[PDB]
Each structure stands twice: as C-alpha cells, then as structure tokens.
Amino acid sequence: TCPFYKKIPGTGFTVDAFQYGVVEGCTAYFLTHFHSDHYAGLSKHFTFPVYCSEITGNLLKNKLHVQEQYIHPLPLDTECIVNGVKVVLLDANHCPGAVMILFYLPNGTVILHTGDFRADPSMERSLLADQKVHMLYLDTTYCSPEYTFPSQQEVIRFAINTAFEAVTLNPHALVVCGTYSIGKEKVFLAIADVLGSKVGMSQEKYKTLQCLNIPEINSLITTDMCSSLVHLLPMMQINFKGLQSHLKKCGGKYNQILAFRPTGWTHSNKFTRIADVIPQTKGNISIYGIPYSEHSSYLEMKRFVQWLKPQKIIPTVNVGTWKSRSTMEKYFREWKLEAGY
Numbered sequence: 001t002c003p004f005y006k007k008i009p010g011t012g013f014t015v016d017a018f019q020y021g022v023v024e025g026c027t028a029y030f031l032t033h034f035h036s037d038h039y040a041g042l043s044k045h046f047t048f049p050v051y052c053s054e055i056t057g058n059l060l061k062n063k064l065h066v067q068e069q070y071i072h073p074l075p076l077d078t079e080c081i082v083n084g085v086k087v088v089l090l091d092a093n094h095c096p097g098a099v100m101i102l103f104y105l106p107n108g109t110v111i112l113h114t115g116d117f118r119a120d121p122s123m124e125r126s127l128l129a130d131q132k133v134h135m136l137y138l139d140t141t142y143c144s145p146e147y148t149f150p151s152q153q154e155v156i157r158f159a160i161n162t163a164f165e166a167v168t169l170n171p172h173a174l175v176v177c178g179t180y181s182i183g184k185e186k187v188f189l190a191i192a193d194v195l196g197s198k199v200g201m202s203q204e205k206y207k208t209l210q211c212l213n214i215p216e217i218n219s220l221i222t223t224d225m226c227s228s229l230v231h232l233l234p235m236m237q238i239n240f241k242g243l244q245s246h247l248k249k250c251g252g253k254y255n256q257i258l259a260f261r262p263t264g265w266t267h268s269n270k271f272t273r274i275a276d277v278i279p280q281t282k283g284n285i286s287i288y289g290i291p292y293s294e295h296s297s298y299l300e301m302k303r304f305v306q307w308l309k310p311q312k313i314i315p316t317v318n319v320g321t322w323k324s325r326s327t328m329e330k331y332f333r334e335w336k337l338e339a340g341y
C-alpha cells in the first residue's frame with residue numbers, strides 16, 4: 001500500500017506512486033522523472049492521467065509504450081490547473097526531464113515536492129522566491145555531513161583532462177563510460193567533444209537519448225561503434241573481465257582501455273580531493289570511479305532548506321529505519337535553530 005509521504009493532502013494527487021495498483025482516491029498521478037524506482041508500475045496498460053515534463057512524457061510514450069491520450073506533459077515555470085488545483089513544474093537539476101512540483105492547495109497551503117534534486121543557489125531565483133512554502137517533501141539521499149562531493153564542473157574538468165592526456169599519449173586507447181539509467185550524460189558527451197569523436201552505443205540506448213531534447217544530439221552520438229573512440233556500456237560491464245571481453249570485440253583497433261564509472265558518493269571522498277583521484281589498473285585496463293552526483297550534498301541541501309524556511313519537512317529518502325529517521329530529524333532541528341525560523 002502507498003506510503004503517506006507519496007500522497008499530497010487536500011488533493012486527489014500522488015507523486016511517484018505507480019507500483020501500488022489503483023490508489024484509493026487518486027484522480028491524477030504525477031511522475032517527477034524517468035528513474036525505475038519512481039516509474040515502477042507504468043506500462044501500455046495504464047489508463048489514468050499521468051502528469052509530467054515533456055521529456056518524461058517522450059520517454060513514457062517511446063520506452064514504456066504508455067498511450068498518448070493518458071500522457072499530460074506540462075511546460076516548466078508556468079502556472080497550470082490540474083483537477084482544479086494550481087501547480088507549477090520547476091527544474092530539479094537531477095537527470096533530463098526531472099522536475100520539482102509546487103502545489104497551491106485550495107485552502108491556501110503551499111507544498112513543494114522536490115522529487116530527486118541537486119539543490120543549487122539558482123533555484124533561489126525561480127518562482128519559489130514569490131511565496132511562502134508551508135510543507136517540503138525533501139530528497140534526503142545524502143542527508144549527513146559526511147557527504148561532501150565536488151561540483152559537477154570540477155568532476156567534468158578532471159574527466160576531460162584525463163581522457164585527452166591518455167588518448168594523445170596513445171592514439172590506440174579506447175575510452176569506455178558506464179551507464180544504467182538516464183542522467184550524467186555530460187560525462188560521456190564532454191569526453192567525446194574533447195577527442196573529436198561521437199559516442200557509440202547500443203540501439204536501445206541511442207533510442208533513449210533521442211527522447212531527451214538535447215541540442216545538436218545527432219551531432220554527438222551514434223550506433224556505429226566502429227567509427228567511435230568513446231563507447232558506452234552497461235554499468236555492470238565496467239570491471240576487468242567485462243572490459244577485456246569488449247576489447248577483444250574491437251578486432252585489434254585498440255590496445256588499451258581507459259574506463260569511467262560515474263558513481264554518486266564513495267568514502268574515498270572523506271580523505272581525497274578530485275585532483276588526487278587514481279584508477280584501479282590491471283594490465284592495459286584502467287578504471288576511474290568519479291564522484292559525479294545528481295543529488296544534493298549535505299551542505300547544498302542545508303543551504304536550500306535554510307533559505308526556503310518551510311514549516312514542516314517530510315523526508316522521501318532513507319525513511320525505512322528508525323536510526324535514519326532520527327538522524328535526519330536532528331539535522332532539521334539544528335538547521336531551524338541556527339537560521340531562526
């Protein structure tokens with residue numbers, strides 16, 4: 001049964017709640033983004049109205065075959081009316097098509113649901129600035145002060161410089177990047193751009209990227225692996241065995257692999273700077289784990305909440321253990337005492 005933190009009080013609405021069958025009293029199902037823990041349950045047989053971004057709606061139609069008549073895409077940064085309630089979709093700085101949802105309840109309460117997000121000071125100048133928010137349904141993935149990571153820009157600088165150096169030293173090196181969901185496209189696109197190559201990938205992944213409205217994409221990606229020196233593989237294949245096997249398939253075109261796994265956080269973050277990151281190596285294969293996050297760090301999250309000053313916070317992540325829940329509630333109280341709301 002649907003958990004309380006997926007239900008929007010005073011409405012007929014749910015958020016990211018497609019795996020519970022027909023939810024009692026739900027008149028409209030919102031979907032924040034196309035990640036499987038959030039869309040789990042949708043298919044061509046779904047016949048209730050789904051509200052989402054344009055990009056999410058492209059993916060529902062093309063990847064999951066949801067019929068068009070049930071997809072209701074909304075423009076961003078625009079006041080819209082859904083079943084008699086004003087809503088706004090805002091960019092969540094997560095993966096392509098990911099949104100936060102502002103709900104303006106008929107009684108005057110204003111609710112922000114962040115979906116999954118990476119907080120940023122740029123959000124302090126969207127339509128959020130214009131009214132008070134009473135209740136915050138918060139992505140608390142990294143809600144603990146151990147979670148520090150660099151900016152996305154520092155991480156991409158590291159990856160570009162590393163790949164450019166390796167391939168200039170050895171023009172027969174292949175670069176491989178792992179993926180298993182949408183998101184983090186900058187990693188492989190920025191490396192292909194510095195090398196003057198397209199990114200090669202499976203037909204299924206090319207299909208997915210073609211749903212994303214990324215400008216000039218026909219210019220950056222391809223299904224012709226033979227013409228590409230940056231390849232995308234499933235995340236599960238980014239290990240020494242999987243990469244040795246791939247290099248065999250390339251027919252002697254290449255004699256070295258440099259591979260990247262964009263993780264979120266890993267405990268090498270508490271001791272080491274990005275500058276100082278080193279790969280795991282075996283023979284002619286090297287693997288870099290790079291801390292490219294699409295969720296808020298602890299300090300990014302804290303700054304957003306201290307700016308927004310909500311009256312009540314409802315966590316949406318790490319809610320399954322009493323120790324997690326108690327930890328998070330203690331931080332929320334600190335933040336409120338330090339800022340004075």
Ligand code: NI
Binds near residue numbers: 033094116
């Ligand atoms: Ni997500």
